[PDB]
Design a protein around this ligand. Structure first.
Ligand SMILES: N[C@@H](Cc1c[nH]c[nH+]1)C(=O)O
Length: 327
């Protein structure tokens, strides 16, 4: 059966956007938070990104998952799959199938922000695996992970290398609060894209076909629609840079010419000097030794580690770290 629990107010999304755009456009370095890439148009564009020749990470992680699903499930020994975020639908089925193969499948707990996407995919998963207890949560990572049920022993999965779109401090902060939700006997499966040839890294985030560029520009179309703004989309160049100090890709929007921009709903006036760049995303790439470290710092011990043949991408399986104190 299905049980959906909706923790997002109707105006929670509207109000956070106002809040965010106002801070982003008035900061000395202008910026916009990546979460706003994912309206209907944006998210279809991202789905198209997962199929681009240059954009290896989705298909690499998918491929590892394919090989290791049986093994993950034997190691988790869980009857309950929690999926943090959705939009990794084919990957979900791999984990669900492997749980069924093992005669262990009992409960599915998707956790996303679109109640409609949840509501639908539940009827589809509920179709394919009859007899399953689906408990969808409409909630937000930074507030509502606590809302996720701790009944049974659970495999909690965070795929799509989303965790890389957070900078060190809020990334440590999210890993830690997430670690707190795990009961003894639960496991976290986490995906992390790895440091590699930087030319391949830059190309992955600025494809030949200009799709990423559209994806990037569309955040302005979002602001235009939702907050009555007049961003000239054609006036901003998509630029992807590799930051070797932070070992991350950064996406920017660079004004070709001097732009003056009005956000009417916010009664905000913004100016873009010619060539001025606006930060819209970072994508952090990990080193195998540091994943183990950031995990332990979060309160999690790696129990398993899997890479694709070319060492492009990592999957980790972790359990709550425990200590023996001395006084
Ligand atoms: N999670 C994806 C989001 C993205 C794709 N392209 C640009 N951003 C990544 O950082 O790889």
């Amino acid at each position: 059966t299905l049980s959906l629990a909706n923790y997002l107010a109707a105006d929670s999304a509207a109000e956070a956007l106002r809040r965010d755009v106002r801070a982003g456009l008035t900061a000395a370095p202008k910026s916009l938070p990546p979460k706003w890439f994912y309206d209907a148009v944006g998210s279809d564009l991202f789905d198209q990104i997962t199929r681009l020749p240059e954009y290896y990470p989705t298909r690499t992680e998918a491929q590892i998952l394919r090989t290791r699903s049986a093994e993950i499930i034997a190691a988790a020994g869980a009857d309950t799959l929690v999926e943090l975020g959705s939009g990794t639908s084919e990957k979900t089925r791999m984990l669900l199938d492997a749980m069924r193969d093992a005669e262990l499948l009992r409960r599915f707990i998707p956790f996303d922000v679109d109640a409609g996407v949840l509501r639908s995919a539940g009827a589809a998963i509920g179709a394919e695996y009859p007899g399953i207890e689906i408990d969808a949560v409409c909630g937000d990572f930074e507030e509502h992970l606590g809302k996720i049920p701790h009944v049974g022993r659970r495999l909690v999965v965070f795929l799509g290398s989303t965790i890389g779109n957070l900078t060190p401090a809020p990334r440590a902060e999210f890993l830690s609060t997430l670690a707190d939700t795990l009961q003894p006997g639960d496991s976290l499966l986490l995906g992390t894209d790895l440091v590699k040839d930087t030319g391949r890294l830059v190309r992955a985030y600025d494809d030949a076909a200009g799709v990423t560029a559209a994806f990037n520009r569309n955040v302005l179309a979002v602001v235009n629609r939702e907050l009555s703004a007049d961003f000239d989309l054609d006036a901003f160049e998509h630029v992807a840079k590799w930051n070797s100090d932070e070992e991350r890709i950064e996406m920017w929007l660079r004004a070709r010419t001097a732009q003056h921009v009005r956000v009417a709903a916010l009664d905000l006036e913004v100016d873009f000097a010619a060539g001025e760049e606006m930060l819209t995303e970072v994508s952090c790439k990990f080193r195998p030794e540091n994943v183990v470290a950031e995990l332990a710092e979060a309160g999690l011990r790696q129990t398993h580690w899997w890479t694709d043949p070319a060492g492009d991408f990592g999957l980790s399986l972790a359990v709550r770290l425990e200590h023996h104190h001395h006084h």
